[PDB]
Write a protein that binds this ligand. Structure first.
Ligand SMILES: [Zn+2]
Ligand SMILES: [Zn+2]
Ligand SMILES: [Zn+2]
Ligand SMILES: [Zn+2]
Lengths: 530, 136, 489, 139
């Protein structure tokens, strides 16, 4: 033993008779943790070696790849990512074939002229015939494809495609992997799922003819993304639990699950603070970089890529003292730059991704407010870090006793708020983002004005104890709601304790109070101008 | 009422005792559930809430209260909330002596105030006390 | 998942080789393995019981079973100990009634304090069979093959029943050559073994997760102390002795469960294992210890309410062997008397710091106080006339005097030269101060308010290792007496 | 020189703001530790003398917490100030062993930092003032 090439005979007999009969009565039948891969099929490594005698180190000595059980078909199809529509086009065709009970292995000749038109029309390549050659081979090292008579083919000079010459000459039967084909033939959910994964990503603006030209109309015509998992509302305790169920990594949540679809994770830090921009159902999601000025790298990069093409993504959320859940699909509608604190507790430039929720990835399902806001986006960064300073954030404690600015250089903040407000007032078509996203500069102004106190002159009284996070127990709120036209400026806003805020919002005399607060807001504002 | 649902010729306001008793009975019966559902655990007993409302008559029961308004809501209830000192989530019982009426300000103090812990201890004490005051 | 019936059927058809136990039709099947095969047809057990199947336990380890031999009683352990001595000396597994009787009956008379030893052997000769110890096959082979297990098992039996180890126990029994230097050396865990969870401890040595006080699989008592926050371990200051709070969760604690066992250990002077998890740290079996005094004190339960609680004063010792115990420990017992020293009197739940009050009931002025100081003096005078004072008498701190200082200082430094200190409280709601004696108890100072002083961390550092500590001590001594006397007029 | 147990004028080799020297070495070492694939608990928790030294040359026997209620200038019996150098972002929680992540505190302020009721806000304040104090010595 001392056996090589007798092995191929052994493998051929394993194919001829079948895995069940091969332990009859050659023996073995023990579980194997490690297999032998040949032409997309797995074989029990000890058993094959034993039969080769009667015709691990040894098998690997004779030139066979010995492998651990492959990752799930879902995962592997999900790993097909750009470094690029060639691979997904072939894959999509293959699924369509399997669904239509075509044979597992098919000659190159037929595959070529069957896929090449698809490659031209949907893969935006010029020479489709040549376009099929790359994935026909490259998809083997993605553990999704196999080529019989591999040995007979002659590879290109630089890298690894086979020559067009070599492929046409040897008409090798290639196809999907064994267990994958069987999976697809037995469980149509998996076929629907894998195709739905490949489609958004890659073909999210599903053109007409897809799904017809591919084998996939009967399978997905109704709605393609229905087969995708997780379902909306699936709940998980840990981030780890999510990871066990759908992959990705537990690193800060902008990342792709096993299916390759982007997922953004928002974890509520304390109570009275969710990602949702108030009065609205839309999300203000802070970007990716954890300690310094954030850059268009890693998750932010992917967010930007998603923003450009108008592709949706999964938005996970864990409320305070609660569980995680995939609560909505969402689309990038605007991106901004803001001052915030990193994990090093230091002020820093950070991205604010403004997400609008949608029912599914299918564009046809997105309400008009979303379509309008995407139409208006321009996809370019809005840098609000010029309008305010980290000192103006409630989260940066200070004396200030910076010589430079008096606390009544609040005027600076109020001015920017007015400038911005006026500029928003002359927007002809305003998006719900334009209307409801709150200007930091105006909030910052109210903070500098009130100095940790209620501004309601009828305040019954309120504590000077701070929160666990070291902020006063107050909230800045507009007297005239932004929803009802009110402007996002300091003279329209007021700092209130929980009691007074409750009085304003659902007190019996809410209305009269509104009037008093409107008056005292304007007054307080004008006092700081002279 | 019991609850504040409608604006007492029968009942003294300190026939709160009636409410507290039902609360205890119910609580005991829920305590001996072998497999309790999340409904059994978290759905809140009207009786106990009612008792707390009768016990503190439109006022904050936090003896350190910085102050709170006496204005009512549009619906005619006091701007208070009845809350457990020992959260039902952490095993605490749904009964009046484990509960306390707090203004929005004091409730914020109890939930995410910097001195939440000490306050929990004060409130636990003053709840039991207030409860036992109405039994004699 | 009832399709497991198909998995069971294949286990029968092919055998145990090919296929916590699962019982079906009088046959036992590996629980986890049956669940797995059913999947193709660690929360496994629940899944099988959710299907209509009765789940049985694996046979208890020899260590566990010998550990289950407890009183409701020296007969059973005497026989067992003889049996282990026999197995170690390569005697035959099964022996006749006749020889066992008149070989063990003398041992039974001398060590089992029974009158008729001949009759004494009869009880455990039969009763030990329903303890799954009567030796068995696998047990006899275990003892013959692995002498650690014999040494462990004998040490376990010797620890619980014969902790005082009278001379001529190891021979007379078969065990002198085996136990040799020290009998408890074969016991596990080793001192210093570290575990993450409490569950991890349980996996390794048994008992249960519930309770501070409980017995491990070996049947030896174990007490568990979990440090709640920083700057707070169980150790009573100026010494290495522990103040371990008792067993009852939420209300006035009673001599039941763990406290009961503690009391049983106190009476006979038996040691026990003391586990400890420092703050943000791991568990570890850090010392053996012996109950040296028990007291009653005011504390808070998990319901945040004041409560009567036991204070077990533990003295650490190198091993269970009494010869290894230092003289301070051996003096503290016998002085013990084994009787509860009670709390109230001088000591109201506030009084001390963990219950906030206005005080809302104006019954007591903050300047009584005087009641506390009086009790402190009384207790002090009574301790001052102790002829032989244990380290507990000397270093355990009187709540009443501490309480008094707290009522006096009102969340402030009492050092009149204080550079300044914050009025912010701790997370737990106490002032950032400490009450400390101006004249250390260690150097004879009395445990009374006029010898104590409240200091901020900075002034405390000044007092303790400041360059001018000595002058400061004088100043503090003066101002303590002064402040004390100001509250008496 | 840079160790607290060596009393000195200092120089004239070094001004006290050749602290820059120390901070540089701390960075260089910190970067080299940051790229350790498998870091032992020693790599993670043993404290770099150079960074500690730097904080000592910076603070000059004083609390760096700008809200310090006050602290004594008396030394210990061993002749060191009653202070401690401590990281604002704990090493245990991934914070770097460098001077701009450290701060010199009196016993009081240190207690405030570790178990005060307003621990969190203070950590932000100290992080800020540590960076600030650090950057003041580079220009
Ligand atoms: Zn107010
Ligand atoms: Zn209140
Ligand atoms: Zn002081
Ligand atoms: Zn300080």
């Amino acid at each position: 033993e001392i056996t090589r090439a007798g092995i191929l005979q052994a493998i051929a007999e394993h194919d001829r008779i079948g895995p069940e009969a091969f332990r009859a009565t050659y023996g073995f039948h023990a579980a194997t943790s490690y297999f032998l891969e040949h032409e997309g099929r797995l074989y029990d490594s000890k058993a094959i070696a034993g039969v080769a005698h009667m015709y691990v180190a040894w098998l690997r000595r004779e030139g066979f790849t010995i492998r651990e059980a492959p990752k799930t078909f879902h995962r592997r199809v999900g790993d097909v990512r750009p470094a690029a529509l060639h691979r997904p086009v072939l894959l999509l065709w293959a699924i369509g074939q399997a669904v239509a009970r075509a044979p597992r292995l098919q000659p190159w000749s037929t595959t070529r002229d069957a896929v090449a038109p698809l490659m031209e029309k949907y893969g935006q390549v010029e020479d489709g015939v040549d376009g099929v050659r790359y994935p026909f081979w490259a998809l083997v090292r993605d553990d999704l494809w196999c080529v019989e008579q591999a040995e007979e083919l002659t590879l290109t000079s630089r890298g690894r495609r086979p020559t067009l010459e070599s492929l046409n000459a040897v008409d090798p039967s290639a196809g999907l992997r064994e267990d994958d084909y069987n999976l697809l033939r037995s469980q149509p959910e998996a076929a629907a799922s894998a195709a739905a994964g490949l489609i958004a990503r890659y073909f999210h603006l599903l053109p007409a003819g897809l799904l017809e030209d591919f084998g996939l109309h009967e399978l997905l015509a109704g709605r393609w993304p229905d087969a995708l998992r997780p379902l909306l509302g699936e709940t998980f305790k840990d981030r780890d639990a999510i990871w066990r169920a759908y992959g990705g990594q537990k690193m800060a949540g902008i990342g792709c699950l096993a299916d390759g679809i982007l997922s953004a994770f928002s974890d509520d830090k304390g109570p009275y603070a969710d990602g949702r921009i108030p009065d609205t159902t839309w999300i203000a999601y802070v970007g990716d970089g954890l300690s310094g000025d954030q850059k268009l790298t890693d998750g932010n990069e992917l967010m930007a890529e998603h923003q450009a093409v108008g592709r949706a993504l999964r938005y996970w959320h864990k409320p305070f003292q609660g569980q995680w859940s995939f609560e909505t699909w969402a689309v990038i509608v605007q991106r901004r730059l803001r001052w915030g604190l990193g994990e090093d507790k230091l002020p820093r430039r950070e991205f604010l991704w403004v997400l609008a929720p949608v029912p599914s990835p299918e564009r046809e399902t997105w309400p008009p407010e979303v379509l309008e806001a995407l139409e208006a986006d321009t996809g370019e960064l809005h840098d609000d870090t010029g309008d305010y300073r980290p000192s103006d954030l409630a989260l940066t404690p200070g004396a200030p006793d910076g010589t430079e600015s008096d606390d009544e250089a609040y005027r600076r903040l109020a001015q920017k708020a007015e400038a911005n407000a006026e500029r928003r007032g002359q927007l002809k078509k305003p998006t719900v983002a334009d209307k409801y996203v709150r200007d930091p500069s105006a909030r910052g102004a109210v903070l500098k004005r009130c100095q940790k106190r209620c501004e309601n002159p009828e305040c019954a009284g309120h504590p000077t104890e701070l929160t666990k996070a070291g902020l006063p127990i107050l909230q800045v709120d507009h007297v005239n709601d932004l929803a009802k036209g009110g402007p996002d400026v300091p003279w329209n806003m007021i700092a209130l304790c929980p009691n007074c805020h409750a009085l304003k919002t659902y007190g019996a005399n809410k209305v009269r109070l509104q009037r008093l607060l409107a008056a005292t807001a304007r007054r307080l504002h004008e006092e700081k101008l002279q």
